[PDB]
Amino acid sequence: AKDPRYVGNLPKIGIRPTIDGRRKGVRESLEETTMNMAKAVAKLLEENVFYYNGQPVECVIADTCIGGVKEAAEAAEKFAREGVGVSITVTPCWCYGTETMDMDPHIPKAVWGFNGTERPGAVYLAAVLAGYNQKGLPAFGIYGKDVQDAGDTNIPEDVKEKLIRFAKAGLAVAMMKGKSYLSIGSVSMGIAGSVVQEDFFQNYLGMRNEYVDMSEFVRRIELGIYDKEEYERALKWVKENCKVGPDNNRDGFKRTEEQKEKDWEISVKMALIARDLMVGNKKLEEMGYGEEALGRNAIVAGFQGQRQWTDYFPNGDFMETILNSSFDWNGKRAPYIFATENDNLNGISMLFGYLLTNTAQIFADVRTYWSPEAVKRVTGYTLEGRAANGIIHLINSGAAALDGTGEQTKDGKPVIKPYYELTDEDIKKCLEATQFRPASTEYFRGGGYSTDFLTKGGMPVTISRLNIVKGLGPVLQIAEGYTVDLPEEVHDVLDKRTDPTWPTTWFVPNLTGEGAFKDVYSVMNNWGANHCSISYGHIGADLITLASILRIPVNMHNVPEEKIFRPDAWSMFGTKDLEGADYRACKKL
Amino acid sequence: AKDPRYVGNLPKIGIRPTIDGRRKGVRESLEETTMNMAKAVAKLLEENVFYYNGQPVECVIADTCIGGVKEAAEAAEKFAREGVGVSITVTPCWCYGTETMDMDPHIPKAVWGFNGTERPGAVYLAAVLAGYNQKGLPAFGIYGKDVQDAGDTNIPEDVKEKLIRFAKAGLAVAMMKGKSYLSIGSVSMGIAGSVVQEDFFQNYLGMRNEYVDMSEFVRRIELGIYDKEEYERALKWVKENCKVGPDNNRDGFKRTEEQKEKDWEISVKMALIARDLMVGNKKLEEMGYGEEALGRNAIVAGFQGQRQWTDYFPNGDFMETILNSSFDWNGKRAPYIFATENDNLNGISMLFGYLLTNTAQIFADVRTYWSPEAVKRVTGYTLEGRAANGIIHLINSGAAALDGTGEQTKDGKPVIKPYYELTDEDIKKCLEATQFRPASTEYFRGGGYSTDFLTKGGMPVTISRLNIVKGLGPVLQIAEGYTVDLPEEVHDVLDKRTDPTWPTTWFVPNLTGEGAFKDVYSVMNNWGANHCSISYGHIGADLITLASILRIPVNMHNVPEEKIFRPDAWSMFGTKDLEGADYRACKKL
Amino acid sequence: AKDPRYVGNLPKIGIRPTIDGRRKGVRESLEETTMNMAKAVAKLLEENVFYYNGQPVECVIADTCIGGVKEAAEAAEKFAREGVGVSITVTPCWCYGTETMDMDPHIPKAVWGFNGTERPGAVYLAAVLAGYNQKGLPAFGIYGKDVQDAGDTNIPEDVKEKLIRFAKAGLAVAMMKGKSYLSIGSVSMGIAGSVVQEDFFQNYLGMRNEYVDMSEFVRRIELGIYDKEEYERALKWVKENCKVGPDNNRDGFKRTEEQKEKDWEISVKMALIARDLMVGNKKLEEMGYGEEALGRNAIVAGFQGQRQWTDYFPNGDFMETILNSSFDWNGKRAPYIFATENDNLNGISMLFGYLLTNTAQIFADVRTYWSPEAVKRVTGYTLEGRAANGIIHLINSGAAALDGTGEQTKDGKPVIKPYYELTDEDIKKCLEATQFRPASTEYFRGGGYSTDFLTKGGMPVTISRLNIVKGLGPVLQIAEGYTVDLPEEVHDVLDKRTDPTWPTTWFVPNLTGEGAFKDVYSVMNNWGANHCSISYGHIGADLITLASILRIPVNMHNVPEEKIFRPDAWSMFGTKDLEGADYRACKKL
Ligand SMILES: C[C@H](O)[C@@H](O)[C@@H](O)[C@H](O)CO
Ligand SMILES: C[C@H](O)[C@@H](O)[C@@H](O)[C@H](O)CO
Ligand SMILES: C[C@H](O)[C@@H](O)[C@@H](O)[C@H](O)CO
Ligand SMILES: [Mn+2]
Ligand SMILES: [Mn+2]
Ligand SMILES: [Mn+2]
Ligand SMILES: [Mn+2]
Numbered sequence A, B, C: 001a002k003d004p005r006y007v008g009n010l011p012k013i014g015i016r017p018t019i020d021g022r023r024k025g026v027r028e029s030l031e032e033t034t035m036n037m038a039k040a041v042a043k044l045l046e047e048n049v050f051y052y053n054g055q056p057v058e059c060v061i062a063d064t065c066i067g068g069v070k071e072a073a074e075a076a077e078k079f080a081r082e083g084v085g086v087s088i089t090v091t092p093c094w095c096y097g098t099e100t101m102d103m104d105p106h107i108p109k110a111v112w113g114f115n116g117t118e119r120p121g122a123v124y125l126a127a128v129l130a131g132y133n134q135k136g137l138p139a140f141g142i143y144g145k146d147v148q149d150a151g152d153t154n155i156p157e158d159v160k161e162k163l164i165r166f167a168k169a170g171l172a173v174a175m176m177k178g179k180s181y182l183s184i185g186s187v188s189m190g191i192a193g194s195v196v197q198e199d200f201f202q203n204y205l206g207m208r209n210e211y212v213d214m215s216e217f218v219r220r221i222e223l224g225i226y227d228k229e230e231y232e233r234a235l236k237w238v239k240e241n242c243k244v245g246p247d248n249n250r251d252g253f254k255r256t257e258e259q260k261e262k263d264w265e266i267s268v269k270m271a272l273i274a275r276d277l278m279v280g281n282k283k284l285e286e287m288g289y290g291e292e293a294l295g296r297n298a299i300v301a302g303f304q305g306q307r308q309w310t311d312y313f314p315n316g317d318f319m320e321t322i323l324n325s326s327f328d329w330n331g332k333r334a335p336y337i338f339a340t341e342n343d344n345l346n347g348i349s350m351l352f353g354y355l356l357t358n359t360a361q362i363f364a365d366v367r368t369y370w371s372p373e374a375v376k377r378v379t380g381y382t383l384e385g386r387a388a389n390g391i392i393h394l395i396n397s398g399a400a401a402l403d404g405t406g407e408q409t410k411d412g413k414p415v416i417k418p419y420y421e422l423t424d425e426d427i428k429k430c431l432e433a434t435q436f437r438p439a440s441t442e443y444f445r446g447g448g449y450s451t452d453f454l455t456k457g458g459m460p461v462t463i464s465r466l467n468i469v470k471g472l473g474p475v476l477q478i479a480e481g482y483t484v485d486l487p488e489e490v491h492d493v494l495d496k497r498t499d500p501t502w503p504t505t506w507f508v509p510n511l512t513g514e515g516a517f518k519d520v521y522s523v524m525n526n527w528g529a530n531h532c533s534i535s536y537g538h539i540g541a542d543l544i545t546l547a548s549i550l551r552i553p554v555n556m557h558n559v560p561e562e563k564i565f566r567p568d569a570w571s572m573f574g575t576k577d578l579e580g581a582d583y584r585a586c587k588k589l
């Protein structure tokens, strides 16, 4: 399947069914059972793993069962020729280890050994993995807990969860390769994550780094380098669906009516240009702007904003909010992972979750830790339920995907769905629960409109953050938890004394009474940056798998140990202290 | 004592009696007491540690007490000429640290400080260990928990354990240096462990690497290069004591009667040739084959087998079974550590446990994990006792020491004893409980005879595996547990649908509730290879101490932490997380 | 084009035409010129570089000029689907560095900047090379010394050389990836190079490692697993074209007539079996041996031989001689790089030169250094010409491609040509100048037929050796020189007292007066092994470029420094001492 936005095709998953090489007996008796095992997996993935556009992941099965090096090489040729980016080996019998290995060091690989009695399937699993570990080519091992009878094409639940987790993590990793990260502007207000370390993108993600100064937005707005037809349509949509809230700037800080109208115009143009830069726009060709039409093939981008741009032009709250949303004037669509303040690292954090879920991600500041004592002192209210031990106030400085309202609903519960599952009502409710407020000119002299909403509580979420530490490299921290609802009057009091014109999410992380999850305070005290990424659902186990593939250790997370799924090689670096083994395995391999 | 099979003598343990060099009163009053400690330690060791031939380990005590560098040099000189390969320092008083140190880097060393009040014995212990830690020379520290009165030569129980544990691990380590690993054939069916990494053998174990193509067996069989008189006796012994069980090959795969008889002949010859290769055979010289007579001075070897050899000739089951056993047509004898499928890493795994116990080791595949739910479905029987949480099927592809029956007895319990403790009954019953079945031709086209037995339950055992992981090097995993008995009818069903003509051992590992031992399944899912070595008894602690001496980290083990005995410097790398400290200490030291 | 012997297709060279992205005038005026450079480079390469089957290398040009990341991604996508394994960027103007870079790390890349004045072509060259050096992606830089007028498509001579040199080295490198090294037998007589270090094959060459015990030859010979119809033709061809020379074994060591005939039969079968193992044989499938039919997809292999096999069966001289030759009973054909004594390192040495020239390589021992004083004493003859400073006796223990005679001719000069350029006369004379002598039974008890010839003098050659040194890894040594002729009677004396039944080549290396080349003796005293590979022509420079691409340092070579062509980053590690820089660059990059 052609990637609808980026060069080339979407990564495919290749299934390698291995078999015993002995003919005139053994091989013939397993030819059908082994091939059927591969088809079952293909069918499973096709029904559970989907590309960011809603299409089912496409699988490629080897033309024959691999029993030796010849057939293994023919498979590689076929997979490489068909654009396979993830490989899964399946078998019910004994196979000749290294002779049947996938030797491509550049793709995520997993091996599923059938837990049957008739043949040494589990023996090949441990044998080939011993090979993988010994050669230094990480591989995941999949082995079901319960014995199944020969030929059982019904994949057991424990096996399913691993195949899917592996597939999604692998697909996400394969999706980033070859793509660009567009840096619009430079470092923002000294924020570490806004500095671009190419080594990370190139070596860890196989991505490219593109750069463009914000003055480009001036040129494109002045010369009208954008779809003017689309612009008018978007300007009209904004006036029909975006409700303007009260202006909080006090006299001396209030922009005029005329200023506020130009603020909406530029903001809209900014959204169009940022998107045109990221994925290009063929409309620009007939307009005489062929080079601009091309785009930067960026699957993720960032906009510096403060201080240089915002001190004169409207801020990027709307642009940053709309791009990340799952809909706009052109209807429902996939989000455009856009990082506020050019925090490229937070952009990647968001990208990880996006590629693992196909759903909008919320950029946000870890602003305040509210202790049960403080909420009581200030509002007189005693936190209850999930909030009984304190809460964390997540609120970006003005921009956040409209999906963050939590108005999207499934089975009566608040969620964030992939754009392709959205209903007309989901969209309308998100928009109605949002209020655009004039930017606080004391911070943003140029003007703009911030996204003001309150995330519905009770929704399971996962916040995460990728950081780069000298002497260690990239490292990931994860925190699964839920969003909470406070009584209306309590929210108002906490909100008014912070920044009521910005988007709000009340977060409670799942505690474990250990590490940095002993209490709510520790979760925040250990956060390694001012920013984090919020994703609907509990994708922590997924993030852990993905990180291990990328060779990025996880310094902090509250995922139950039984869900941790990493390449077989990790266990050789330690089994009593997984965190320790994670660091040792990442560095060495 | 002279090593009966290999070049040179058996390693000796040297005792160094350190003392306060100060005369005028101090030393004159401590020589007798110090020497008495040395004498006490030698007596203790000679009664508890034995070479693989049953002979008690021989100790050497310094000619004088050691209170300075001159006397220390004198000791080194004597030990070197006396062939010492392990040293133990003893003292009841203060001595001058580095001036009294054993500076040999290639010799396992321990220091025992008397826990007496009169003199600073414990003060010397800590002072000199700090020295060994500063100089980078690992040394074990032994301190008794209960204060003893000056002169008491009764070695406390907690001190005895460590002294013996150190002595055994050290002896095992010293036993391997200079010996060869004979590789017969090359890589077998792509099994990672059949690849020979000379670096490991030379640098960790100080062993030599010898190689010989299996075609050598053809030459010797065709040209009758072997003791023809022994061959006859051997053939006659096999016929009188080896019962041939039912042939499971289905008509289209059955070998004629003529072939089956030839299979026996060649199988017996294979045994003789393999053994002649490992330790030579003076008989060959008389026959005119002087080069062949010499042998490869190998204390451990392996035989490729599949696919090349077994595709035409009788497999090596009988050869691999008889060599590893503690007896044959020539009566009871030490075993010959022999690796199936030329898996040298499992060969070393077996050699480890063999040098620590003097008993036959069982080579086997980690074939199937049987959950209680699975056994209930397949048999309708509910697992009880140690089996209630699940069992692991350990069964090599056809070969296993006859000791593996568990028919040997001590105090009415099943055990595997050192060959020198065997009674004629023990031997007789091991053979009785065993059936030699015609090899499965679909797998082994050239015929042969696999070993079929069922290890008796209730026997304490320890399974282990050495693996080599890229970016880490050698790493060991241990799992202590027990063999179990299953209802006769329950066993038959489970056995018939697996591989009934191969040796079976039902294994249940001890669980800790944490790490790789939260449940039976986890133990198998964390095994880093398809093979393992089974040793009678619980020798995890001994293995851990041995591995620490070899600087080989232990990624997985269920040995109670209180039993962990490692060089003093290990704790300098951490006390809260021994696993992490093990890796740090192994790497830096 | 499809690779005739191995899985998949032959590597293609991709051309990337980079341009200034600026429209409005610049780019519109440079597309034609840029594309023309690409076309010129493709035409040049197709006329000068050829696959090992004589077919001209196939090039692929980007669909559009490359002025940004989008077009660059487009190029990557196309090249990947077109099976490109080597890339060359071309341009006559300035382009945007990193935006136009080829980011594939696993593909040899070069950049050619036009030396024109109109545009900043040379400025792009240096700018993008700096980029490749900063990102750690080696890339060759090609700059012409003479300014050319805009539009000139005539590629200057100095640029042609580098383009072709890069193309050939890159092709050779791309040719090995995915291919297997077949190891038949194990270590031979303790020769370091017969030990297989998978790490090298997998990480430096991207090759697979296959293994098969020599006992396989017994099975196939006994069970007639080979083309019986070809065998007959082969036996008949040997009798009509292979002359049997005098038997040098002295009565007590002569083999009967029956044995000598069997020796021929088995020798011919050995050749067929070895070849069937390397590339399979569809004929085997028809015969019912489908697994055997597949082959091991090996582009290079080795045969242990001594001691195990030769102690009973006919040695592999004929097999090793015929396989490496450019012709046999089936006519002229590409050679089969085959290593004597399973010395895989010499196999790779030969494979290197073979992939750079498409010609048979000569396997040989560096047997004796003959000083002028020594030859004067033993023969009374004074060495003249190139031999005046001494000669080195290169003579393998019995095997050598018949091409080694030097009987092939071009312009009245002795040479070794690619099989596709051979005339019937060439072949006829190679056989005529060769004598097959009965193997020396004192060394090879099982019989056989060694190859006896005398390479003609005056032929330019290059000998080379790849070694693996602990603490360094792979390291290559080169020595260009010439073969020489000695008076007929002088040769006989020197030959008779060495080994007259083995192939002889009198070698004289070029001296530089410095390093390992101050004198003939120094060249041999600095050879790091007993073996070497002899290739026709002076290919040191080509080898150096190939080694730099493989990141394998060259410890010794007599190639004029002006001819050294390495990735641009190499000079960043030093310009005054290229040897030191080579090591620093190989290690860090
Ligand atoms: C207005 C402020 O600069 C605000 O944007 C910052 O505090 C930002 O939230 C830092 O992450
Ligand atoms: C018959 C089979 O090849 C069997 O020997 C293998 O599966 C072996 O158990 C691998 O460890
Ligand atoms: C006959 C000898 O073994 C000969 O083959 C060896 O010396 C060989 O040349 C070693 O390279
Ligand atoms: Mn912020
Ligand atoms: Mn609000
Ligand atoms: Mn096995
Ligand atoms: Mn049985």
Ligand SMILES: [Mn+2]
Binding pocket: C341, C364, C365, C396, C397
């Ligand atoms: Mn040689």
Ligand SMILES: [Mn+2]
Binding pocket: C452, C453, C454, C500
């Ligand atoms: Mn000659």
